[PDB]
Design a protein around this nucleic acid. Sequence first.
RNA 1: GGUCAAUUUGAAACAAUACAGAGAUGAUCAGCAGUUCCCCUGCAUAAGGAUGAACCGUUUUACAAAGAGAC
Length: 367
Amino acid sequence: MLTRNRELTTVLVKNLPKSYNQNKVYKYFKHCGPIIHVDVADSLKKNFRFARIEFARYDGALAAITKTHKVVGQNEIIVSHLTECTLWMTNFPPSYTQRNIRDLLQDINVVALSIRLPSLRFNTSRRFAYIDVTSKEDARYCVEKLNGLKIEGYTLVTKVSNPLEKSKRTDSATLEGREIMIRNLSTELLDENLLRESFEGFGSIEKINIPAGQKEHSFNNCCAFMVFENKDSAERALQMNRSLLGNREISVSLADKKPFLERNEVKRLLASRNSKELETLICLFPLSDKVSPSLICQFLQEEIHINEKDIRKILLVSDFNGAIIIFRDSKFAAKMLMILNGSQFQGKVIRSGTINDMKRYYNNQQN
RNA sequence: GGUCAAUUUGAAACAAUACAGAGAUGAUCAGCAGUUCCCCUGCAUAAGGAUGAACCGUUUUACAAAGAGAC
Ligand SMILES: [Cl-]
Ligand SMILES: [Cl-]
Ligand SMILES: [K+]
Ligand SMILES: [K+]
């Protein structure tokens, strides 16, 4: 659990003159110690400015705090540790942006100093944010107003940040190594009570899940998932791998997680030579590793005016600082190509191209 | 047609979308090992050091069917 604690390195400066931007907060405080990052924000009535400064070390911060109550051309500033001012927020809509979060707070009259979103490099689905406000009391006010708020059909979660209090995820059985997947069952074997009787001896079973539609399209091979109450039981159930059940040699293994599956689907595309498949897709690059496929979807629909039905899938390729958009057909993909190349996304200009173009652009970013 | 196979198919990824920062990761983008070059200490083609970058190996791998290509 021990990693870092920003309240030892990060200070809050209150009452800076309206002229003070990032650049010149930097210049004022950089003698205090080396600085990693500065953010600046207007007060509610635009009468003064707040700054948030992350120092490289706690002693840079303590040095900054020695300037509390000093005068910066006209104004008596206050410099303190930024402590108890961090919120954590999740279950906002998939396409919600840093700006949207900032307007959310602004509509309740709360200044936001910093809003930090996670890298999607290793998991495309991550969706949460940390948000620093200017007082403990604002933080409490945000929870009271925003926790439980319905936004575009999503019930928001907003809390005072405390990672030690985090909750169990609804899919944590799989992360703990407690869920097995059973493969190559026949339709005759794809029956809950049948699997239950055959696996109960390994340990107590918590859940059995059978993906729908396997009998109904009568598959040759069917699959199922089973969650045990503890790890050891599931590990014992792996002895059933390569064993006889009815007329089948079945397979049994610990279920994989979505990020692992999704990454391998991307790799398959990145190695395809099936030009049929490749004619249907285009890449956008370069993109921040914070940008999700939902945000890209929303861009495509709201700003480029594409219909949702024309878009089959959107996948991240953060190792080349891009994304892949698979369209309904190649003719549509070819028009979109010209339209998207040079378009604006998140206030910067993006490009579109084939996979190879995305690589060339990335390799050349390396040089 | 014997030995290596990029890959394809059987074939279905459930379980609540979110659910704790680059504070994240499973070779998921890894570990280990090697080669060349880049960067700082030096008269330097002597010896150290930290980064990189381009490469080369090796470790790993449910089952069945089919298979560009490669001895
Ligand atoms: Cl810190
Ligand atoms: Cl925290
Ligand atoms: K903290
Ligand atoms: K390797």
